[PDB]
Amino acid sequence: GGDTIFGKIIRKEIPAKIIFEDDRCLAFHDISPQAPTHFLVIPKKHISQISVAEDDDESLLGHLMIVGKKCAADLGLNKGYRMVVNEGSDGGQSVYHVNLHVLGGRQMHWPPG
Amino acid sequence: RPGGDTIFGKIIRKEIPAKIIFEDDRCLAFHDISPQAPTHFLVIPKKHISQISVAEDDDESLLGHLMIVGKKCAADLGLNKGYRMVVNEGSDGGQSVYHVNLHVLGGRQMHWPPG
């Protein structure tokens, strides 16, 4: 679903440790985890970044968050976690395919970067 | 009460002043009083949800609406170089108010990891 490494993951062309899939999104462990649990939830629709998401995408974006919180519960994150979406250079976005980070299993600190 | 018992419920009902950026029937965006970036605001639902871990399946559109309002407000505030959106869940997430709230931070380089 797109012209990035995450499109290749969606198409199963390169491996990832997949946590959950449905017809419109995919959740998988981050290859460079920043916490004991660190996974991504991505749409299969290639939205390059949250700044270009459309109004009609609202329920899809909320679906990523609902999938994210369900996966976090399944992975035992009962003490809490942090969800992150990066936009652009200042946001530290590393792949131009919208992706929701879910980090847990340790105390997350403030500020969030 | 509409909006709940937390400080964010009082902000929704105009009982406590806030610096409001955007308001509609489903959510409210306002500046954080303890900013962690040159621009730092929150987007909250007007419906009280204590935390993301108890959000219902039917809350999908509302949660997505928070991010759409977040990115529109970021553009209106001139965060053209980018920004970071954050939702904190629970103790390990650093959640400070138990009313779902999306943080939007920008105006400086954000670092990795995100806390």
Ligand SMILES: [Cl-]
């Ligand atoms: Cl990213």
Ligand SMILES: [Cl-]
């Ligand atoms: Cl919070």
